[PDB]
Structures are given as C-alpha cells and as structure tokens.
Amino acid sequence: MATFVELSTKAKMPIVGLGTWKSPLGKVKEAVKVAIDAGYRHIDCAYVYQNEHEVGEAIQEKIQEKAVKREDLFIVSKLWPTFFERPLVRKAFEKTLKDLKLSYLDVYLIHWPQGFKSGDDLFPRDDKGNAIGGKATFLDAWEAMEELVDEGLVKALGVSNFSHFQIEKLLNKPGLKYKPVTNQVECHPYLTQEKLIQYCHSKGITVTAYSPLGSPDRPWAKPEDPSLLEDPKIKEIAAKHKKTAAQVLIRFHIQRNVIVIPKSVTPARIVENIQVFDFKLSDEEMATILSFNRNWRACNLLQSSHLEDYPFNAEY
Template identity: 60%
Template sequence: MTTFVELSTKAKMPILGLGTWQSPIGKVRDAMKFAIDIGYRHFDCAYVYQNENEIGNAMEEKIEEGVVTREDLFVVSKLWCTFHEKSLVKEACQNTLAALKLAYLDLYLMHWPMGFKAGEELFPADENGMIIPSDTDFLDTWEAMEELVDAGLVKSIGLSNFSCEQIERLLKKPDLKYKPVNNQIESHPYLPQEELVNYCQSQEISVTAYCPLGAPNWPRGEDFCLLDDPKIKEIADKHSKTSAQVIETFVCVLSPFKVFDFELTKEEMETILSFKRRYRICSLSM
C-alpha cells in the first residue's frame, strides 16, 4: 500500500492529507491536534482560509509534546491572488510562515493563475461585483516564488487550479529555474479532469485532488451529494466499504496510487467515469 508520492525534487509527500478549507476558527486547532494524534502528516493550508494561526498553534503544541517533529510534517500553503505582484510575494510567504510558526514550508502553491488587485480585501470587486484583476502576469509571480526556494523559505513550489495551457506556458518560460512539482485541482467523480491529470503526469508534476468527496457542507444550487450517489453506494456495498472510501480510491487511482485494502474493478472505474456531470464546486464566478 503506497503512503507517499515522490515529487520531482525527491521530497516525499504523504498521499492522504488533511484539508483545512472551511475549518472554522475555534475548531480547527482541536481538529489539527486530533489529526496529528491519529497519524495525519500532510496538511493543506492557505492564506485565504484565514485560519493559519490556529493551525500553527496546534502544530507547535504537538511538536513541543514530542508527538511529532517538524521533519515528520509535510505542510502546504498557498499564495493568495492579491499578492501576485513580485514585490509582495516574499512578505506574503513570511506572513504565512509566522502564522504557522514554521521556518519553512514543504510546498508553496500559487493558489490561482490570475491575480487580483493588491490590498486588504481578499476579493476586491468593482461596482458590478466583478473581481478587479491585477496587471501582473503569473510568469512574473513565479519568478518571485522561485526566489523563495533560493531563500530557504520553501522546499518546493507548485500550482493550484492551473489548466494544461497555463502549465505549458509556464514550462516554456525561457528562464525557468524551478519546475512546478505539484498542481492542486478540484477532482472527484463529478469532475475527474482526466486530461489535466494525464498531462501533469506526463510533465512529472504530481496532482493533489481537493474536494474529493464533493465538499458535502458547501452550499450548492442543485442536488449534489456524491456520498449519496446510488451508483457509488452500490459499489461501496459490494466491497463492504463506505461511499467515501470508494470515492477516495477512485481519485487515488486517477493519480495513480493505492491507499486502501481494496481495488475498484475496471468496470467500476468506467461506471464512475461515465457520470459526465462535470460539476465544479470552486468556480470563482465573480
């Protein structure tokens, strides 16, 4: 059973990680401590989640208790869109490190390929409710992220929510110093993104799936609950597993890794891939 993926930098990233999106202040600290106690070592954070201070407190406590060392943990965070200007990238990373109480990040991702107007607002909008963009090209932002590696603030850098075309544009950058090691994307049975996953693998870029269970608590405008999908429940019953285990196995097979003590048959994979709903949870409709 595989427990980690080896990045192109030879770093080992645990396959299963705890996402901290929607983890509220007042609860995320205890959730983090419990996760560390039961064996989680990969933690996915982001400035925009606005909870990195509590996450940092939890990790600090567990390190001081001797439950884990810093080296045991694989901590990921993300550069938010309002910090895409080259002059803002280093300070943004340092602020995240201060909140998380860490000297370095194992992986730092560009959260989205597009930048927003710099300032205090996370989602700066005009009078029509549309996001005000930044003039900074993500290729310039990447140069500033490369400097973070040289400064020892991050071990590796990567992407999030990047398409094949955007990744290709970055890889063709003439003076590219560090290739992205990871692309974190929304991926689940209603949005498997096989083409993007295959492209990343062809470029030695690992893929991390977010919302693999479909973000059950996230409000949506239509009936959408992967865990209650009758075809998934039928497969789960056949294997005497939960719907969540079936979905996680499906997402890991796309990657491709095995993390549980059962496998989906070719026919079961084809059944799940045939859903064709292509429902996107994180669409940034603004």
C-alpha cells in the same frame, strides 16, 4: 500504511492530506491534532482561509509532544492572487509562515492563475460581485516565489487551478528556475480531469485533488447541484466493500496516483477519511466511477470569468 506520491524533487508527498478550508477557529486546531494522531502528515493550508495561525498552533503542539517530527510533516500553503506583485509575495509568504509557526513550507502554491487587484482586500470586486483584476501575473508571482526556494524557506513550488495552457506558459518560460511539483485542482467522479491529469503526469507534475467529496458545505451550493455522497452509484460501490461513500471517493484518487485532500473538522470523519489503505476498488469499479464525469465544478469561480487568466474556459 499511508502511502506517498514521489515528486520531481524526489520529496515524498503523502497521498492523503487534511484540507482546512472553512475549518473554523476553535475546531481547526483540534482537527489537525486528531489528524496527526490518526496518521495524517500532509496538511493543506492557505493564506485566504485565515486560519493558518490556529493550524500552526496544532502542529507546534504535536511536535512539542513528540507525536511527530517536522521532517515527517508535509505542509502546503498557497499564495493568494492579490499578492502577485513581487514585494507582496514575500510579505504574504512571511505572514503564512509566521502564522504556521514553521521555518519552512514543503510546498507553496499559486492559488489561482488570474491576478486580482493588489493588496489586502482579498476579494476586490465590483458592484455585481465580479473580481477586480490586477496587472501582476502568475509569472511575476512565480519569480518571487523562486527566491523562497533559493533561500530554503520553501522546498518546492506548485500551482493550483491551472489549465494545461497555463502550465505550458509556466514550463516554457525562458529563465525558469524551479518547476511546479503539483497542480492542485478540483477532482472527483463528476469532474474526473482525465486530460489534465494525463498532461500533468506527462510533465512530471503530480495532481492534488481538492473538493474530493464535492465540497457539500460550500457557501454557494444550489439545491439542484449533484451530491457525490448521496449518489446511489457511488454508494453501491461503497456497500460492495463495506466502506463509506467518502472512503470510495478518496480511494478513487489514490488508485490514479493522485494526492487527495478531504476536509473535515469532525474527529470521526477525519479518521474515516484516512482509512482507505485496507481495500481496493476493482478495475471495473474504477471504470464505472470514471464514467460518472459531468464536467461539473463545485468551484467554478464564475465571478472571475472575465479575467485574462481565468482557467476554466479551456477544455483542460
């Protein structure tokens, strides 16, 4: 059975969710439909993925067809940092919610802590491709997002790609109404996030692991980049359980009580990826996997590294 991680709000967040970044139009609706049929309840979405309108169609279909009730779904989206100015937070949210055809979101995340130039150019950049910053901050954004929770449009807020310093800046903000329920960050055996997970858990903040398979189809991959799915040592552990590497990579997070959101539009893989509750990695296997840490990021966003709130300069 597909288990949950309890949030600070007492809401139950399904521990495996479906990722939707780069899920193409014409495939993402079917991906969400297959996922819901396979027992997924948690779907991870974003404004910047530009496919929320199709995700919304799929969700609406399955609810209509009595496959699932809204209350049993757990829908997450994210505020892109070109929308940190107060009026833009509301407008960006309204587009996300309208696209998803929902009356509320379960969690709404700040997608990245660093502010970008405000507006509807999602990737404002210079000639070299470096991100253009904006003066509105994640605290400005949070302020506007808190209204959504007051109004019942969002059940809980969270953050993504925040370091512990940025989470501290948020938690210690005088006059804070709502606390983040999760920090969605890259996490897998090459980036085990031990210090950040410990920190977040100590503050009652869950962690959601993105790119758990190493994001093998990311547009900026470099052939010398490591490959988790083909890693002989990961494969060895998979073989031990007669499971696939992907299932080991997903189960890894489950055993750390970390939510994990593998992306697929392939029905067989969508099913495979949630077949992770009928085996257990041994204490020794978990220790071996943790030892693979390389501090390697598939998502380092180097093009924003000059910005004030770029999160990856800190140790954690």
